[PDB]
């Protein structure tokens, strides 16, 4: 089997991407944030505290003839941005782009933090990291990909995120028309439960390539590119007027400035992030100060190849017995 679904930016800045997901019988379609940095499929629901729901579409398990309470099960998660959610668990039928999993753990939110309430466009998350990170207790649950894997034509999924435009998640096949050149594959460590890999270096604009190992994760659920402070400093030093603002919480720059591209290494191959991808607009309405899309990972404890980086590439998440990551230009 295979599946193919369009993923759409939630706003004009590509702050996140939502993908429609069918849950239950009859189908209840929710728009979920596909997150290769986590491993819980959780949704706004009829069980979510009423005051914490503000415009989201909810899953109502009582209206699904295939929903079954996973008795005794609870879940609770926190994310890198300080947001969180928790609740209980049902199993139900879940379909993405024509690909159907029966008995998928669907984690129903009883509580969500303010960040989630305040974002009306995201109805929940669909985690695509390794199932070892899944927070369901007492019995850890498998991700949608893990459940689908054996049925797929090939045990892979791909992320093809758009810049200020829709893109595609495919399951079970590699669309050879979706990228240019060849796909370069690189080793993955699953030791922290992430799609963790080592970039071979970087360049800023037309500058010479710096060979240096950068360990990080391929994370569709993180908006920006978070790299070591040295790398980030080297980038913004090439932008006139750029500075790191503690009050804002990162690098900002005048929008009159031209942003250089940023290149990262995948083995001997090179992915070029165009400068425009690194512009996240005014820090506040009417401000001449713009927020940068490349920021320091210092104090995150890990480097994150988020959407800014991933949307410059066609990315293969290869879930073979020994997982790997593939990157192509497009």
Joined together, the tokens standing for residue 118 give 């305040």
Q: 129, 95, 93, 125: which is closest to 108 by C-alpha?
A: 125
The answer to whether the beta carbons of residues 75 and 136 sit under 8 Å apart is: yes
E strands, 113-193, in order: 124-127, 156-160, 167-171, 184-187
Query: Looking at domain 5-174, does it have CATH number 3.30.450.40?
Result: no
Dist. CA 107–CA 131, nearest whole Å: 14
Q: 146, 76, 147: which is closest to 107 by C-alpha?
A: 76
The answer to whether the beta carbons of residues 147 and 104 sit under 8 Å apart is: yes
CA-based end-to-end distance of the chain: 25
Q: Which residues of 291-300 are buried (b: 16+ CB within 10 A; e: fewer)?
A: bbbbbbbeee
Q: Which residues of 256-282 are buried (b: 16+ CB within 10 A; e: fewer)?
A: eeebbbbbbbbeebbbebebebbbbee
71: helix, coil or strand?
strand
Q: Catalytic residue among 14, 35, 146, 307, which?
A: 35
Q: 271, 233, 270: which is closest to 250 by C-alpha?
A: 233
Domain residue ranges of the chain, discontinuous segments joined by + = 5-174, 175-330
Dist. CA 144–CA 273, nearest whole Å: 30
Per the annotation, the verdict on 329 as an active-site residue is no
Topology alike, domains 5-174 and 175-330: yes
Joined together, the tokens standing for residue 85 give 């959610």
Q: Which method was it determined by?
A: X-ray
The answer to whether the beta carbons of residues 37 and 304 sit under 8 Å apart is: yes
> What topology is assigned to 175-330 in CATH?
Cathepsin D, subunit A; domain 1 (2.40.70)
Dist. CA 124–CA 330, nearest whole Å: 29
Strand partners, 304: 217, 226
Handedness of CA 115, 116, 119, 120 (dihedral sign): negative
- H helical segments located in the chain: 114-117, 144-148, 229-236, 307-310
Peptide bond into 189 cis (omega under 30): no
248: helix, coil or strand?
coil
Per the annotation, the verdict on 279 as an active-site residue is no
Query: Alpha-carbon Rg of the chain, whole angstroms?
Result: 20
Q: 112, 147, 110: which is closest to 128 by C-alpha?
A: 147
Dist. CA 110–CA 50, nearest whole Å: 9
Q: Catalytic residue among 199, 261, 296, 297, which?
A: 199
**How many C-alpha atoms does 135 have within 13 Å on its Cβ side?**
20
Dist. CA 142–CA 104, nearest whole Å: 8
């Amino acid at each position: 089997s295979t599946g193919s679904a369009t993923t759409t930016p939630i706003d004009s800045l590509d702050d996140a991407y939502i993908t429609p997901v069918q849950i239950g019988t009859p189908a209840q379609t929710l728009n979920l944030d596909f997150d290769t940095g986590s491993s819980d499929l959780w949704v706004f629901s009829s069980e979510t505290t009423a005051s914490e729901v503000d415009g989201q579409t909810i899953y109502t398990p009582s209206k699904s003839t295939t929903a079954k309470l996973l008795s005794g099960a609870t879940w609770s998660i926190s994310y890198g941005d300080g947001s969180s959610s928790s609740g209980d668990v049902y199993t139900d039928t879940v379909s993405v782009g024509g690909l159907t999993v029966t008995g998928q753990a669907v984690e129903s939110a009883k509580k969500v933090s303010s960040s989630f309430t305040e974002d009306s466009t995201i109805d929940g998350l669909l985690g695509l990291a390794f199932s070892t990170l899944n927070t369901v207790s007492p019995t850890q649950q498998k991700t949608f990909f893990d459940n689908a894997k054996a049925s797929l034509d090939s045990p892979v999924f791909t992320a093809d995120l758009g810049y200020h435009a829709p893109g595609t998640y495919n399951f079970g096949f590699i669309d050879t028309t979706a990228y240019t050149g060849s796909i370069t594959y690189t080793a993955v460590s699953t030791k922290q439960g992430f799609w963790e890999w080592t970039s071979t270096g970087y360049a800023v604009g037309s500058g010479t390539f710096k060979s240096t190992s950068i360990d990080g994760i391929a994370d569709t659920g993180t908006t920006l590119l978070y790299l070591p402070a040295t790398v980030v400093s080297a980038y913004w030093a090439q932008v006139s007027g750029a500075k790191s603002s503690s009050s804002v919480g990162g690098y900002v720059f005048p929008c009159s400035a031209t942003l250089p591209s940023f290149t990262f290494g995948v083995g001997s191959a090179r992915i070029v992030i165009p400068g425009d991808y690194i512009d996240f607009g005014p820090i506040s309405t009417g401000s001449s100060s713009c927020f940068g899309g490349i920021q320091s990972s210092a104090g995150i404890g890990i480097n994150i190849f988020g959407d800014v980086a991933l949307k410059a590439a066609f990315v293969v998440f290869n879930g073979a017995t020994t997982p790997t990551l593939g990157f192509a230009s497009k």
